[PDB]
Amino acid sequence: VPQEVLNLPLEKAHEEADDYLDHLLDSLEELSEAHPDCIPDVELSHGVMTLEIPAFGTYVINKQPPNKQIWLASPLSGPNRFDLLNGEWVSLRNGTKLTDILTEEVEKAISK
Amino acid sequence: VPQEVLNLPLEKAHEEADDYLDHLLDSLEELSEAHPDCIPDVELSHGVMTLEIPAFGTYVINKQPPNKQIWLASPLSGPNRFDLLNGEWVSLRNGTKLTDILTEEVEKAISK
């Protein structure tokens, strides 16, 4: 019934997971230079993001319906799922930032 | 297969968000007296509740499918989304009770 809501420059919020992934893509395809191209490819299609790291295998990162929201399948650290706590994404299993998991794993490759 | 469950005075639980909103409506349309009618209207239709506060703009409060459950769009403090912690509703972003956000904002109007 109210109008003084839809004459605002109105907008559907983003999906909180969607926003993480897009920020990860340009953070990661930027890191897709600091390899001797031994982390050669990262692609994101429809909330599925694949990350080729030949040293370990291939990563798959998902948007997922909840008992939680972002799903990580690590060729190295295994599978894990994450939901928002205080505005960072966190393992339901134990509570670790996936930011940290990815961070560590990515840079364990740069060593090689 | 068991009967001694359905000869109980049986009942579908409520939606936890639904219960919050109904409690907010009579808490707020009661506060729709303690204004010099400068918070003139509050309506709740189908899990959408609008709150007119001319001083700031119009509030919209939603039931929402999860990465969390109650969605707040504040003409003043902006958007935010909330899920249950220990039986109160809490910003996924930072962890603040929306009870508090609403409380503060409502009474920042009573000042005027």
Next chain:
Amino acid sequence: VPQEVLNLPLEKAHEEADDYLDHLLDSLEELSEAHPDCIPDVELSHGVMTLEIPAFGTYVINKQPPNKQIWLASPLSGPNRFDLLNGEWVSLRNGTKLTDILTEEVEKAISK
């Protein structure tokens, strides 16, 4: 587009609730010996598990779509719903492990 993901021995993850319930069933139908058969039956069909405890009434335990995931209806302690925290399931209301609720309630029967 990537193959070196689907020539892995691939697998859909389980539902975190599903895994809890299956572990509860054999933990409970094992306890369906340590009664003077006064906790005579426990059945699990399609993510609905019923538990007959004549002393108190019948329990129903559910897989549920979220503002949380496992739903408990206790003939004794009432209803409650639970989501993962740090890999254990926890009352949204107050934060107690349902493991504990069930544990206590089950063994309050063994007293009799």
